[PDB]
Design a protein around this ligand. Structure first.
Ligand SMILES: Nc1ncnc2c1ncn2[C@@H]1O[C@H](COP(=O)(O)OP(=O)(O)NP(=O)(O)O)[C@@H](O)[C@H]1O
Ligand SMILES: Nc1ncnc2c1ncn2[C@@H]1O[C@H](COP(=O)(O)OP(=O)(O)NP(=O)(O)O)[C@@H](O)[C@H]1O
Lengths: 409, 628, 110, 628
C-alpha cells in the first residue's frame, strides 16, 4: 500500500519543513535541477484519499498533468510534489489537509480537511520564455508582490549577479532607470525582463545575444557588443513605470517627446539598440492605453507612429528586417496612408527580398506623394530584384530534365 | 364434472415477489415513496369536497428518517392512512390494491391519477427489510401497527405509541447486509433518480450538526415537473431553471420543444437542445441516449436506444405518460411497439424544433457549430427524414464570405444554365478553396459548396439530390459544366490535338491511373487526379483507410479508379506535347510525366504509394538549385 | 351500479373492447349507430355492472358482435368508416377512470 | 395483537401473470415445452428404479400439433402426466410448483435437473390462448381433462376420450388474432431460438404433404447440447458439427474451449473461434456479442454486453449453468455480480485459448490475419490483460521480411546494448520500411517493428513496455540509439557546426516547426519531420483527423509539435549551411528551406497545410527546368 505508506515516510519537500508533503522515491530522476516558479511541468499522477476513494489521474489518460509553479494547478502538495522531482523520478506522495484544500473540499469525492495520497512520476519541464522567441528564459526562485511591474521609465533597486557565457564577473546591488542600462552597467535583457518582475521576486535569467550590453559591451569585464549572458536578479524595490490604469497618456507623451529625441541621439550615435529601447518604450507606454478622449487618442497614436517609424530605421540598421516590418505593420495600423510608414515597409520587405510585397507599398507611397523619388527608385529596385532572381533561377535550372536524362547511366 | 377456483401458494408467491420480480434492490424506496404519493393524493382528493378531512393535519408531505443505531429506515407521510379493514385487506392480500379500487369508483371529471395498480409494490420492502412495521392512522378508525417478516403471516395491533393524527409510518428494520440504504448519500441518489418529480415534498432527516440536533434536508424534490403545465403559459426562464434541475448543468438550454400527443398513446414531452455538445457525445457508448421516460411522474427508464435514433442522442429530455403498460418490475416498459410510436413523434417534433430554430439565424449558428455532426449523421442513418434534414444543412461556399449557407440559398443564387449543385470535399477549407478542381468553376462564376468534415463524405452518399438539382462532386470524372458551343468545339479540337500525348502518358503511368484525358475543369494547374464515379473519392479513400475497425476486403474494390486530367493550355503541357511528338520513349518525358502524376496525387489529396521515391526527385531538383 | 373495468384497442375495420368481468353472468350488449351499452352481473358477488359508451365515431350494429368467456366479455364494433383512426373510444374528451388501452394487442395499424 | 395469514386476490394475481410478467408472447411455447421436458425427466427418473413405470409407453417425446381449422396449438407430451389431485394442486394453485416439490423429494445424489421452479410458467399459455384444455393420464390414475379461460376458476373431469396411455396433451385454443403461432415458420423460429437444446425429441406435425396426412417435421432439435459431456469424450469433428449446428456456418471452428467451472457459480461453456471474421463483425453495432446464456439447457439471453468485452465479440459460444438466479420472465438474470464472475472466467480462458493456439503457428496465422484487430483493440480497452494480450501480437519487422513475428522474437534478437523496442507506424509496409526515420537503425543492424493498421496507433498508447523494454517510436524526438562515445562526440561537434543553420531555418519555417535540430536517426535523407515525445505521431494525427464523430477542437489540443531534424552529412545540408551563413535573407535559401520542409512533411507521413501552394513550386521548377 504505497499511498498508505507515504502517510509517515519520505523526504520532507515542503517550503515550511512542516512534514505536510512527503515523497518516497522509488527511482531517482536525471539532472540536479528540480522545477522552479513559472516553469511548465509535466507529471504522471494516480491518486487516493483518506475516505478510501479515488482522486484524479493523468496516468489513466496516458498524458501528464501540466503545472505552472507559484500559480499552481489544483493541490498545493501537487505543486510542492512537482517542484521537488528530477526528470524520470518515480515516487509516492503525501498531501496533509493544509496542503490539500483546508476546509474547502474538492470534486469528485474529497471531504473538508481530507488527506490525499498518490503514486507519481515526473516526465519533463520547460522554463518561462519571456517573449516566446528564445530572447530571454526566466526561472523563478521566489515569487514577489505586486500587480504592476517596473517596465522602461521606472527607477528600480535590484541585486544583480552577472555571467558572461556562464563566467561570473559582477555580484552587487545596482539602482537604475529602466531602458538605459549600458549607461548603468546593466544588459538590455535586464531592462526587458524587469517588465515582468514583482517586489522581492528572486529569479535566474538567461539572456540571448540581442539582450547583452548592446553596441557598448563591457570591456572592464571582457564582454563584447551583443554578448549572450546569464543572471541572478532580486527586484528589491521600485518607482513603477506607470501602466494605462495607473497614469494618463499625457504624462507618457511628454516623456515620449523627450525619449524620441534621446532615441534619435542614440541612433545618430550608432547605439541602435539604445534607440530601439527609446522608441520601443514609447511603443510599450502608448499602445497599452484605453479610456482616452479623441484628442488624447490622436496624440497617443501620433507618438506611437513616430516611434514605429524610427524603430523601423533602427531595426533596418541592426539588419533585423523582420522587426523593422513588424514596426511598419503598426505604423500602417495607426495610419494606413502614412508616407514614411508605407516606404519603410517597402524597404524592410525588399531588403528581405520579397519584392512583390515591397512594390505593393511603394506604389501606395506614390498615391500619397507622387513626387517621392525614393519610392520610384525602390520600385525599379523591386523589378531589378525580380528580373535578376528569375534570370539567376533560369541560369541554374535550365535544361535540368535533359541533364538528368544524360546523367542516368 | 367438478369446478374449482384457482388458489395461490402464499409462501412461494411472496418468495417470487421478493426474489424474482425486481432486479435492483434500490427500487424499494421508489415503491414506498409511490405508495406515500398515492396515500397523499387520496386525502388531497377527498378533502376537495370536505376540508374537515384535513382536521387531523394539513401539511401533505413525505419524510425519510434513516436511524443508523436502530439499523432502521423509516418512511412517513401525512396521506389518508388505513383503517383496520384496509390494513388486513390491502397489506394482508397479495395483488389487492386499494389505489386501483379507489380510482374505479371515481367520475371522469376527477383531477387525480395515482401510481399504484398491481397490488405488489409494498412487498418490495422485503428486498432490504428483515421485518416491516406499518404504523397507520385513518380519520375513521384508531391508530394501528401492522407488522411482519413476510413469513406467511402478519400481525395487526392497536397502537398505544406516538399519536400521528392522520397518515402512515412505514418502518423498515433493515438486513445487516443492506445498511447502505441508511447512508444519506445513497438515499439522495435513489430518491433523486427514481422519484424527484413526485408532486409532494420528500424531506430527508440527516444527522446532528458537528448545534442543530438533527438537520433535515428540506426537499429531495426541490423542483417541479413543469412539462405537466400548458406550453403557452411556461416562460423560457422557467424552462431554463428546469433544464438545470433536470441535468445538473450550470448552463441554459439553446432551444426547447414542449408538446403533447393525443390518441391511443397519450404523452407529454420536453426536448431540450443543450447550449454545448457534451465532450463525449459520440464517444460515450454507455450513455447511449439522453431521454428519460416517466409514467405518472415516476421514472421508468432512460438509456433505451429505441426512444430516439442515435443522431438525436444530444437532446436532453423527458417523456411522461398516463397509461402505458409497465413490466411487473416497473424497471421497464412492456409493449415495445409503443417505443416506435414514441420515436416517430419525438423525431417529428425535433425536426419542427430545428425548423423553427432555423428562423432564428443567430441561435441557429450556435446550434449548427456543435450539432452539424448530428444533422449529417441523420442524413446518413435516417432515410425518412433525409428531405427535412437536408434543409437544416449549412455549408461554406465559393460565393460565401467565410459564412455558412443552406442548399436553398445556393438554389437562390444558381445561374439558370445550371442543373446541378457543385460540391467539393477535402481536409481543410483552404485545401479545398485553393484546390485545382474549382479553377474553371471560379472562371465561369459558378458557386461551389465546400464540405470539409470527415462526416460530410458519408452525408453526400445519401444526399444525391436537393430540389430536383443533382448534388455533383467536382472531384469525379467528366464534370458537366454549362459550356457554350464555341467552348464545346474548342474542347473537341483540344481532345483531338492532344490524343497522341494522352496515349503516351497512359503508357508511362499504366496501372497507376485507369486513363489520361483532356480537361474541361482546369485553368492554371497543368493536371489533376479525379476518380471514376462508382467508388470512393480521393477524400473518402483517405477516411476509409483511417477507420481502425473497418475490414480491408472492401477497400480492395471500393477504392475508385484514378483518372489523370490534363489542362490543354498549360505551358508545361504544350511543351510536354512538343517533347512527346518528338520522341515517345524520351527519358526526360518518362521522369517528367511520373513527376506530374505524383504532384497531381498530392494536389488531388491522395497519398503517394511511396513518398520517399517522390522526395528523391525534389532532393535532385534541390541539388541543382543549390549547385551540387 | 358501477361501470365494469374495460381494456380497448382498434384495427382498420374494427374497434375492440374487453370488459374484465371474470365468471360473468346475465351479460347483455346493445349496439346502435353512435352508442354501445353493456351490462352484466359480476361472477364473484353478483354486483351489477353498467357501461354506457357514446362512441367517438359511427359503427355498424349489423357487423358488430360480442362474446362471453369465464374470464371476460369481448365486444367487436364495426367502424362506420374503415380506415378511421380512433384517438379515444368516446365522442367526449372524458377521462373514464375504468377505461384504458389494451397494450397486449394494440398496434399502430394505420 | 391479532395474527393473520397473508392471502392473494386471485383475479388480480392471474392478471399480473398474463399482462405484466412476460413482455414477449412467444415464450408461451418455451414454457409448455419446459413443463413437458420436466414431465419427461420425472417419468425417466421413476423408470430408473422401477422400469414398469414405462409399461404404459416407452418413448419419451414432445409433439407440437398445430391445427389451423380448430385454431388450436396442441402440445403432446409422453412424460409422467398428472393424477386428479395433481391437476387440482399444480395447475389449480398459482405459484405451487410440482416440479420443485418432486426435485426436493429426491435424494441429493440424484443425477437429474429440471427447468421449473416458480410455479407460474403454465399460466403463460394465456398470453396466446383464449382457452386451455389439459388432457392427461398418470400410471396410478384415470384420464382427466382440466379446462379454463383463466377465469378465476377451472373444471376437472374424467375425460374418457381416446386413451393417452400416460402423459399430457395441452390444447391451446388461440385468440382471434394470435394465429401466427400456428405457422410452421413461426414455430421453427421459437423452438430453434428458445428450446433447441431440450434433452428430448421435439417433433412438429403440420398441415399435409401435397403423400402423408401431415408433415412429420421429425425433429426441431436434431443437435444435442455437446457442452454437457466431458472435454475428453469429444473429438474435433463433433465440436465442428456442433459449431455448424449452433451458427449455420459451413466451415469448422478454428479453435475451441470447453470449460468446467466449479464453486458458488457453477457453469460450463463452449467458446468457438470462427474460421473467419464476420463480414459485419465491428460494423453490426446491434450485435454486441455472439454468446448465448442457457440455464438447465433452456435459453435465457443472448447479446448481453456484460458476458464478454466487445473486443471478444467474434467468439460464437454457449454458456450453460444449473444454479443462476432468473428474473420472473426468465429472459434475464437478477444479479449483475453473476455476469461479472462469468465474464472473468470467459475472458481468462479465452486468453488461455489464444495462448494454446499461438503454439500452432499455421493455425495462429489463420487466426491473426482476421482477428488481429481484436487483440489490438483488446490492449487498448482491457487494462488487466495487456500483460497477456501483448504475447499474442504478431507484426512485420525490418529483419523478418514478409513473415510475422512476436515481441518475444524481437526480444530474442535484440542487441545487448538495446534497452528499447524500436517501432514505426504508417499507411503501408513499404512506406515505413523505405522511410527516412529508419535509416541509421537499419545501418546499426537494429530491428524496427512495422505497425500498419490504424488500430495499432491506439494499441501503442497503452502498450508502453514489454518484458521491461520500452517501446519507442522511431518517428519521435530524442531517439536514443545505442552508439559509441566517439559517435556521441561527433554528434555534439556536428550540433556545434550547424547551430547557425538550425537557427536560420527556424526563422524561415516560423510557426511551422517548434525546433530545427541536428540528428542521428538519418543517414541518406537530408531531413525529416519528427514529433515531440508527448504529442500525436504523424500517423496518429492523420487517423484522428479522419474520425468523423469526434469533436476536433476537444481532441486537437495535442496535435503534433513538429520538429525538423537535419542530417549533417547530406550534401544539400552542408551546402545550405554555407549559403545561410553567407546571407540569412538569400531568396534561394528562403525558397529551398521551405521546399525541404514541404518535402519532409510528405516523406514523414503528414499532409500539407495547402497542397496547391506546394504544387505551384514544383510547376515553377518544371517551367524553369524546361526553359518556359
Ligand atoms: N402509505 C400508505 N398510505 C395509505 N395507503 C397505503 C399506503 N401504503 C400502502 N397503502 C395501501 O396498500 C395498497 C397496496 O399497496 P402496494 O402493495 O404498495 O401496491 P399498490 O401501490 O397499491 N400498486 P403498485 O405500487 O403498482 O404495486 C395500496 O393500494 C393502498 O391501499
Ligand atoms: N405436461 C405436464 N406433464 C406433467 N406435469 C405437468 C405438465 N405441465 C405442468 N405440470 C405440472 O404443473 C406444475 C406447475 O407448472 P407450471 O405452472 O408450468 O410451473 P413450473 O413448471 O412448475 N415452474 P416454472 O416453469 O418455473 O414456472 C409443474 O411443476 C408440474 O407438476
Amino acid at each position: 500500500s504505497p499511498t498508505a505508506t507515504v502517510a509517515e515516510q519520505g523526504e520532507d519537500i515542503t517550503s515550511k519543513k512542516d512534514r505536510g508533503v512527503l515523497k518516497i522515491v522509488k527511482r531517482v530522476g536525471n539532472g540536479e535541477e528540480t522545477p522552479m516558479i513559472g516553469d511548465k511541468v509535466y507529471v504522471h499522477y494516480k491518486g487516493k484519499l483518506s475516505n478510501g476513494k479515488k482522486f484524479d489521474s493523468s496516468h489513466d489518460r496516458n498524458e501528464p498533468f501540466v503545472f505552472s509553479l507559484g500559480k499552481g494547478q489544483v493541490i498545493k502538495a501537487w505543486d510542492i510534489g512537482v517542484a521537488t522531482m528530477k526528470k524520470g523520478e518515480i515516487c509516492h506522495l503525501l498531501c496533509k489537509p493544509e496542503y490539500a484544500y483546508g476546509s474547502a473540499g474538492s470534486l469528485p469525492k474529497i471531504p473538508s480537511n481530507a488527506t490525499l495520497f498518490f503514486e507519481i512520476e515526473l516526465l519533463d519541464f520547460k522554463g518561462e520564455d519571456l517573449f516566446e522567441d528564445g530572447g530571454i528564459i526566466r526561472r523563478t526562485k521566489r515569487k514577489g508582490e505586486g500587480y504592476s511591474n517596473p517596465n522602461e521609465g521606472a527607477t528600480v533597486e535590484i541585486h544583480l549577479e552577472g555571467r558572461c557565457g556562464g563566467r561570473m564577473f559582477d555580484c552587487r546591488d545596482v539602482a537604475f532607470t529602466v531602458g538605459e542600462g549600458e549607461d548603468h552597467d546593466i544588459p538590455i535583457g535586464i531592462d526587458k525582463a524587469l517588465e515582468k518582475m514583482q517586489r522581492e521576486e528572486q529569479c535566474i535569467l538567461y539572456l540571448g545575444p540581442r539582450y547583452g550590453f548592446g553596441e557598448a559591451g563591457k570591456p572592464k569585464f571582457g564582454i563584447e557588443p551583443n554578448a549572450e549572458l546569464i543572471y541572478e536578479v532580486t527586484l528589491k524595490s521600485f518607482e513603477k513605470a506607470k501602466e494605462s490604469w495607473e497614469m494618463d497618456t499625457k504624462e507618457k507623451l511628454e516623456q515620449a517627446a523627450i525619449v524620441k529625441e534621446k532615441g534619435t541621439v542614440y541612433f545618430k550615435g550608432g547605439k541602435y539598440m539604445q534607440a530601439v529601447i527609446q522608441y520601443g518604450k514609447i511603443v510599450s507606454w502608448l499602445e497599452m492605453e484605453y479610456g482616452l478622449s479623441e484628442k488624447e487618442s490622436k496624440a497617443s497614436e501620433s507618438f506611437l507612429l513616430a516611434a514605429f517609424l524610427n524603430l523601423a530605421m533602427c531595426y533596418l540598421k541592426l539588419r533585423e528586417y523582420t522587426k523593422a516590418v513588424e514596426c511598419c505593420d503598426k505604423a500602417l495600423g495607426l495610419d494606413s496612408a502614412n508616407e514614411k510608414g508605407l516606404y519603410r515597409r517597402g524597404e524592410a520587405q525588399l531588403l528581405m527580398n520579397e519584392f512583390e510585397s515591397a512594390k505593393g507599398d511603394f506604389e501606395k507611397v506614390l498615391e500619397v506623394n507622387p513626387q517621392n523619388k525614393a519610392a520610384r527608385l525602390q520600385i525599379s529596385m523591386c523589378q531589378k530584384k525580380a528580373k535578376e532572381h528569375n534570370e539567376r533561377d533560369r541560369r541554374i535550372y535550365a535544361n535540368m530534365f535533359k541533364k538528368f536524362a544524360e546523367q542516368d547511366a | 364434472v367438478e369446478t374449482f377456483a384457482f388458489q395461490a401458494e402464499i409462501a412461494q408467491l411472496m418468495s417470487l415477489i421478493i426474489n424474482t420480480f425486481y432486479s435492483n434492490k434500490e427500487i424499494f424506496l421508489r415503491e414506498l415513496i409511490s405508495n406515500s404519493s398515492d396515500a397523499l393524493d387520496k386525502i388531497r382528493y377527498e378533502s376537495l369536497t370536505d376540508p374537515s378531512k384535513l382536521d387531523s393535519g394539513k401539511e401533505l408531505h413525505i419524510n425519510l428518517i434513516p436511524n443508523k443505531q436502530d439499523r432502521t429506515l423509516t418512511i412517513v407521510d401525512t396521506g389518508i392512512g388505513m383503517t383496520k379493514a384496509d390494513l388486513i385487506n390491502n397489506l394482508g392480500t397479495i395483488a389487492k390494491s386499494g389505489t386501483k379500487a379507489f380510482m374505479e369508483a371515481l367520475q371522469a371529471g376527477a383531477d387525480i391519477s395515482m401510481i399504484g395498480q398491481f397490488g405488489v409494490g409494498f412487498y418490495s420492502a422485503y428486498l432490504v427489510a428483515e421485518k416491516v412495521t406499518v404504523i397507520t392512522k385513518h380519520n375513521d378508525d384508531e391508530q394501528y401497527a401492522w407488522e411482519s417478516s413476510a413469513g406467511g403471516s402478519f400481525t395487526v395491533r392497536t397502537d398505544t405509541g406516538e399519536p400521528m393524527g392522520r397518515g402512515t409510518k412505514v418502518i423498515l428494520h433493515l438486513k445487516e447486509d443492506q445498511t447502505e440504504y441508511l447512508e444519506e448519500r445513497r438515499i439522495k441518489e435513489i430518491v433523486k433518480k427514481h422519484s424527484q418529480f413526485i408532486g409532494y415534498p420528500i424531506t430527508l432527516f440527516v444527522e446532528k450538526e458537528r448545534k442543530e440536533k438533527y438537520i433535515d434536508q428540506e426537499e429531495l424534490n426541490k423542483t417541479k415537473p413543469i412539462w405537466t403545465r400548458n406550453p403557452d403559459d411556461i416562460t423560457n426562464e422557467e424552462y431554463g431553471e428546469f433544464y438545470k434541475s433536470l441535468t445538473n448543468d450550470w448552463e441554459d438550454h439553446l432551444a426547447v420543444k414542449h408538446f403533447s400527443v393525443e390518441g391511443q398513446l397519450e404523452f407529454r414531452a420536453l426536448l431540450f437542445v443543450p447550449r454545448r455538445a457534451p465532450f463525449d457525445l459520440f464517444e460515450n457508448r454507455k450513455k447511449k441516449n439522453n431521454i428519460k421516460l416517466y409514467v405518472r411522474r415516476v421514472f421508468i427508464m432512460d438509456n433505451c436506444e429505441e426512444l430516439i435514433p442515435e443522431y438525436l442522442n444530444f437532446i436532453r429530455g423527458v417523456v411522461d405518460s398516463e397509461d402505458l403498460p409497465l413490466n411487473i418490475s416497473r424497471e421497464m416498459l412492456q409493449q415495445s411497439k409503443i417505443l416506435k410510436v414514441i420515436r416517430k413523434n419525438l423525431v417529428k417534433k425535433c425536426l419542427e424544433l430545428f425548423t423553427e430554430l432555423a428562423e432564428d439565424k443567430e441561435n441557429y449558428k450556435k446550434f449548427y457549430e456543435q450539432f452539424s455532426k448530428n444533422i449529417k449523421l441523420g442524413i446518413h442513418e435516417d432515410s425518412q427524414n433525409r428531405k427535412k434534414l437536408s434543409e437544416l444543412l449549412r455549408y461554406y461556399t465559393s460565393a460565401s464570405g467565410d459564412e455558412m449557407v443552406s442548399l436553398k440559398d445556393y438554389c437562390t443564387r444558381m445561374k439558370e444554365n445550371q442543373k446541378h449543385i457543385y460540391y467539393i470535399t477535402g481536409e481543410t477549407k483552404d485545401q479545398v478553396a485553393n484546390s485545382a478542381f474549382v479553377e474553371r468553376l471560379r472562371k465561369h462564376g459558378l458557386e461551389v459548396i465546400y464540405m470539409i468534415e470527415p462526416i460530410d463524405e458519408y452525408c453526400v452518399q445519401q444526399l444525391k439530390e436537393f430540389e430536383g438539382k443533382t448534388l455533383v462532386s467536382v472531384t469525379k470524372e467528366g464534370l458537366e459544366l454549362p459550356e457554350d458551343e464555341e467552348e464545346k468545339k474548342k474542347q473537341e479540337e483540344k481532345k483531338t490535338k492532344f490524343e497522341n500525348l494522352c496515349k503516351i502518358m497512359k503508357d508511362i503511368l499504366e496501372k497507376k491511373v485507369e486513363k489520361v484525358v483532356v480537361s474541361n475543369r482546369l485553368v492554371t494547374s497543368p493536371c489533376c487526379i479525379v476518380t471514376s464515379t462508382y467508388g470512393w473519392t480521393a477524400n473518402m479513400e483517405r477516411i476509409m483507410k483511417a477507420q481502425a475497425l473497418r475490414d480491408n476486403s472492401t477497400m480492395g474494390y471500393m477504392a475508385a479508379k484514378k483518372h489523370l486530367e490534363i489542362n490543354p493550355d498549360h505551358s508545361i503541357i504544350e511543351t510536354l506535347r512538343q517533347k512527346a511528338e518528338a520522341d515517345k520513349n524520351d527519358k526526360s518525358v518518362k521522369d517528367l510525366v511520373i513527376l506530374l502524376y505524383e504532384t497531381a496525387l498530392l494536389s488531388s489529396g491522395f497519398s503517394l504509394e511511396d513518398p520517399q521515391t517522390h522526395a528523391n526527385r525534389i532532393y535532385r531538383m534541390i541539388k541543382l538549385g543549390l549547385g551540387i | 351500479m358501477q361501470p365494469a373495468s374495460a381494456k380497448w384497442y382498434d384495427r382498420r375495420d374494427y374497434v375492440f373492447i374487453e370488459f374484465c368481468v371474470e365468471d360473468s353472468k346475465d351479460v347483455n350488449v346493445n349496439f346502435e349507430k353512435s352508442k354501445l351499452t353493456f351490462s352484466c352481473l359480476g361472477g364473484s358477488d353478483n354486483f351489477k355492472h353498467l357501461n354506457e359508451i357514446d362512441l367517438f365515431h359511427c359503427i355498424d350494429p349489423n357487423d358488430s358482435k360480442h362474446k362471453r368467456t369465464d374470464r371476460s366479455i369481448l365486444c367487436c364494433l364495426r367502424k362506420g368508416e374503415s380506415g378511421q383512426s380512433w384517438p379515444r373510444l368516446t365522442k367526449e374528451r372524458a377521462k373514464l377512470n375504468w377505461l384504458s388501452v389494451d397494450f397486449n394487442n394494440w398496434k399502430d395499424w394505420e
